[PDB]
Amino acid sequence: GNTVTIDFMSADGIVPGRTPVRYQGVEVGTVQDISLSDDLRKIEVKVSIKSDMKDALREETQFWLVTPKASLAGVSGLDALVGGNYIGMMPGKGKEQDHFVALDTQPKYRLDNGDLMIHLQAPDLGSLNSGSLVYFRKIPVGKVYDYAINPNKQGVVIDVLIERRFTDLVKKGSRFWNVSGVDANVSISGAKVKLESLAALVNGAIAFDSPEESKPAEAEDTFGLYEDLAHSQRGVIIKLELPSGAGLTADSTPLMYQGLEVGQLTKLDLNPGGKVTGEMTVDPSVVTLLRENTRIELRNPKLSLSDANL
Amino acid sequence: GNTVTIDFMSADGIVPGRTPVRYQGVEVGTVQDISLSDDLRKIEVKVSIKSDMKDALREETQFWLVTPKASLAGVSGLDALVGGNYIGMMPGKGKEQDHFVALDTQPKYRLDNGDLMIHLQAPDLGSLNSGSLVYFRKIPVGKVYDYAINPNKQGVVIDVLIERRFTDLVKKGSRFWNVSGVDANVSISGAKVKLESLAALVNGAIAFDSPEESKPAEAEDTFGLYEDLAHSQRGVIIKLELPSGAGLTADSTPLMYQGLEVGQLTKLDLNPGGKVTGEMTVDPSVVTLLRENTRIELRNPKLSLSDANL
Secondary structure, eight states: OOOEEEEESOOSSOOTTTOEEEETTEEEEEEEEEEEOTTSSSEEEEEOOOSSOTTSSSSSOEEEEOOOOOOSSSSSSOGGGSOOOOEEEEOOSSOOOOEEEOBSSOOOOOOOSSOEEEEEEESSOOSOOTTOEEEETTEEEEEEEEEEEOTTSSOEEEEEEEOGGGTTSOBTTOOEEEEOSEEEOOOSSOOOOOOOOSHHHHHOEEEEOOOSSSOBOOTTOEEEEESSTTTTOOOEEEEEEESOOSSOOSSSOEEEETTEEEEEEEEEOOOTTSOEEEEEEEOTTSGGGOOTTOOOOOOOOOOOTTTOOO | OOOEEEEESOOSSOOTTTOEEEETTEEEEEEEEEEEOTTSSSEEEEEOOOSSOTTSSSSSOEEEEOOOOOOSSSSSSOGGGSOOOOEEEEOOSSOOOOEEEOBSSOOOOOOOSSOEEEEEEESSOOSOOTTOEEEETTEEEEEEEEEEEOTTSSOEEEEEEEOGGGTTSOBTTOOEEEEOSOOOOOOSSOOOEEEOOSHHHHHOEEEEOOOSSSOBOOTTOEEEEESSTTTTOOOEEEEEEESOOSSOOSSSOEEEETTEEEEEEEEEOOOTTSOEEEEEEEOTTSGGGOOTTOOOOOOOOOOOTTTOOO
């Protein structure tokens, strides 16, 4: 077979003879040996590519080191029980190059298998990582490919890869929400905690929905990752100038209509002039009741010793 | 290859033929055999360095013993399931030395790969250790290199190693806060516990932020590790001479402004003259309201059987 020299910054995890160099699953090359440079400043790894894939290491062939994703077995010790840290390779355009520089992260998604790659803006990564599942009706239809930091450092961008036979689900009006960790709630007569998804509890997950009247999403389309299922709920956003938010909370303050909750507070700000404004998301079923002469009244719970409404 | 004799204080974990002697990942030497000294007082380990790295063991080449970091798999027994305890080596300046003394800890960070090394002062280590991750937007961008005790014994100094492609994040006005363990909170109608980061729960973590108007941090720059995300919040620190702190707590005592919390007590001391002074951090949005004729009033919650404000 052939032979090539890659330049790594740290030969940790790479062992000669064992570590493979695979392209989209199939093993291709094998690490021959690791050796320090003359100045002992960069690591030169020798790889033995197959004698048939001599046209893949042309000029732009990128090599990088992968990891077993560290899913509850790498964090809790157990080093010699997971993964092999292979060397991912992506073929290039054209040259006779035989000395490469290892990339510090895997490149963009250049493949084309009819499966979607969409982007999700987020304020932060949450408890996601490469390998977190994307769900539709709690059916796994994709996975988090990789995440990057937004150029303006204001958020992160996650890359979700929806598998081929499910690309009809991602409509242009879909909504992705984070389902991660545990949501143990406690109240009085109602301190009920239910947990069903285990993988979401370990390495997080995303979920999405699909309206039935919007066009299918194209590749590299951008959505926004909501914090939870509740924050993703549709409904009209109305603005309130409320007197002073005292018992009000940014969420969990309902808009009751005949005892049925038909909305919630979603924003509770403090304007410069001392005025406390807010924003409330209203169920689309009662938007027809938001007219000129419709009041929205703060109401306090009375004792009412008759019923006492505990 | 060559051959050298290192002087260890305890040959525990070192096994002949198996334990390697690696420099920044790449295996170089191999432990030939362990033998006691003539007086049976110090351990002489024989190492077989490669025949090409004969200019690395010059005079100042430092050798030390490493460990698999004891992450939930070394503490819970499981001895023969993690790590190999290799011998780290750092090349020296110049001589023909062939008999070394093992260092009891790894030396300073002398490398230069364009990646940052910053220092974090702390009152104590917290639940951190070599290998705890440093996060930006919950994206791992670094790791705790090693920790030392401050010369004056008053605190500890942690050494954080921010990777190369992320050094633009650490601004000179950044703020690092400890994210470690679990923060299970319980209240009445609100006893909500959420956990997302698993590695932070096991072996702790640090997180930091990045202002958009300060210069990038240089190497060996010093920051202060805050206790949590809350203690790191920016805002102006005002001083109060309060009458007697009775219902006040060092934290979790808000400064309400029209029902919206715009500050908190952060310090609650007792001066010698019997005067109880305090310090309160105020949201930078209401600093313009801190003028000469602005009062700050203690207020107790009334029954108010109408609403009762539970």
